[PDB]
Amino acid sequence: TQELGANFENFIGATEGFSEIAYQFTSKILTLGYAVMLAGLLYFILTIKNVDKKFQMSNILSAVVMVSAFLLLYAQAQNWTSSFTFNEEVGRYFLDPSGDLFNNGYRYLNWLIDVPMLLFQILFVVSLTTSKFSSVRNQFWFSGAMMIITGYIGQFYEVSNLTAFLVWGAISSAFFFHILWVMKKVINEGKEGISPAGQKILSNIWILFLISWTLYPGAYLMPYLTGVDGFLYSEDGVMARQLVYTIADVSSKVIYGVLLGNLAITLS
Ligand X SMILES: *C/C=C(C)/C=C/C=C(C)/C=C/C1=C(C)CCCC1(C)C
Interface ranges with ligand X (CB under 6 A):
111, 114-115, 118, 147-148, 151, 154, 169, 172-173, 176, 213, 216-217, 220, 249, 252-253
User: Among residues 173 and 262, whose Cβ is nearest to ligand X?
Assistant: 173
Q: At its nearest, how many Å lie between Na ion and the CB of residue 264?
A: 44
Q: Is the Cβ–Cβ distance between 128 and 190 less than 8 Å?
A: yes
Residue 213 binding target from ligand X, Na ion, ligand LFA, none, CB below 5 to 8 Å by type: ligand X
SS3 95: strand
The rounded radius of gyration (Å) of the Cα atoms in the chain is 20
Residue 232, Cβ neighbours under 10 Å: how many? 18
User: Among residues 85 and 234, whose Cβ is nearest to Na ion?
Assistant: 85
User: Among residues 85 and 251, whose Cβ is nearest to Na ion?
Assistant: 85
Residue 45, Cβ neighbours under 10 Å: how many? 14
Q: Which residues of 107-141 are buried (b: 16+ CB within 10 A; e: fewer)?
A: bbbbbbbbbbbbbbbbbbbbebeebeeeebeebbe
Q: At its nearest, how many Å lie between ligand X and the CB of residue 76?
A: 12
| Residue 85 in the binding site for Na ion (CB under 5 A) | yes
Q: Is the Cβ–Cβ distance between 248 and 215 less than 8 Å?
A: yes
Which residue's Cβ has the minimum distance to ligand X?
151
Residue 90, Cβ neighbours under 10 Å: how many? 10
DSSP state of 129: S
User: Among residues 86 and 108, whose Cβ is nearest to ligand LFA?
Assistant: 108
CA distances from 65 to 89, 118, 218, 244 (A): 43, 8, 22, 19
| Residue 123 in the binding site for ligand LFA (CB under 6 A) | no
| Residue 260 in the binding site for ligand LFA (CB under 6 A) | no
CB within 8 A of 148, min separation 6: which ones?
Answer: 108, 111, 112, 115, 172
Residue 78 binding target from ligand X, Na ion, ligand LFA, none, CB below 5 to 8 Å by type: none
| Residue 19 in the binding site for Na ion (CB under 5 A) | no
Q: At its nearest, how many Å lie between ligand LFA and the CB of residue 188?
A: 17
Binding site for ligand LFA (CB under 6 A): 32, 35-36, 39-40, 42-43, 46-47, 50, 57, 64, 67-68, 71-72, 75, 103, 105-106, 108-109, 112-113, 116-117, 120, 148-150, 152, 162-163, 166-167, 170-171, 173-174, 204, 207-208, 210-212, 214-215, 217-218, 221, 225, 244, 247, 250-251, 254-255, 258, 262
